[PDB]
Amino acid sequence: NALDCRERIEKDLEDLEKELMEMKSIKLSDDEEAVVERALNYRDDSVYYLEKGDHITSFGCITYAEGLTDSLRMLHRIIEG
Amino acid sequence: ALDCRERIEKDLEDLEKELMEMKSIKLSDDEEAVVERALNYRDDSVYYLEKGDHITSFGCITYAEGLTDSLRMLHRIIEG
Ligand code: IUM
Ligand code: IUM
């Protein structure tokens, strides 16, 4: 499956990075900041497994991180302020 | 591997329990959207597993786990 090929994972990582920076652009609670930190840990893990050639684990890590991050984004409508 | 049938089946059973429990506490409207999305992605995982698309199923379940775990991290029993 092309979902876990190198180029797709790389682009997933780039997109996650932008999303994390986006969430860092607003005030988050300490608990939400802990979610961000966990997402960053899983980003780092995704990169590790990609670099070791384990695309399935890498893909799992990035999608988990995307879930963590997308939840935060959904809890903060951009028109919330 | 993390995406073998046995592992995905266990992931799906575990997530169902987590979601049923999250489903039945007081949630904000925004959190309800997240729970709905997690349930939808669990259903997608179930579907792709039936089709034998293990990578796709695995992506769906891990995404749903991330959505769900984020909520769990915002609802610590002992907040501190
Ligand atoms: O396959 U490249 O950066
Ligand atoms: O999806 U959970 O621990």
Nearest C-alpha neighbor of B60 from the set B75, B38, B80: B38
Cα torsion at B5, B41, B61, A72 (round to 10°)? 180
Query: Do the beta carbons of residue B12 and residue B61 sit within 8 Å?
Result: yes
What fold is seen in the domain B1-80? Answer: Substrate Binding Domain Of Dnak; Chain:A; Domain 2 (1.20.1270)
Residue A53 Rama label (left phi>0; alpha psi -120 to 50; beta): left
A residues 4-43 closer than 8 Å to B (CB)? 4, 29, 31-32, 34-35, 38-39, 42
Nearest residue (by CA) to ligand 1, atom 2, is: A7
What fold is seen in the domain A1-81? Answer: Substrate Binding Domain Of Dnak; Chain:A; Domain 2 (1.20.1270)
Nearest C-alpha neighbor of A31 from the set A60, A81, A71: A71
* Experimental technique of record: X-ray
For chain A, what's the residue count? 81
Query: Do the beta carbons of residue A21 and residue A70 sit within 8 Å?
Result: no
Resolution of the experimental model, in Å, one decimal: 1.3
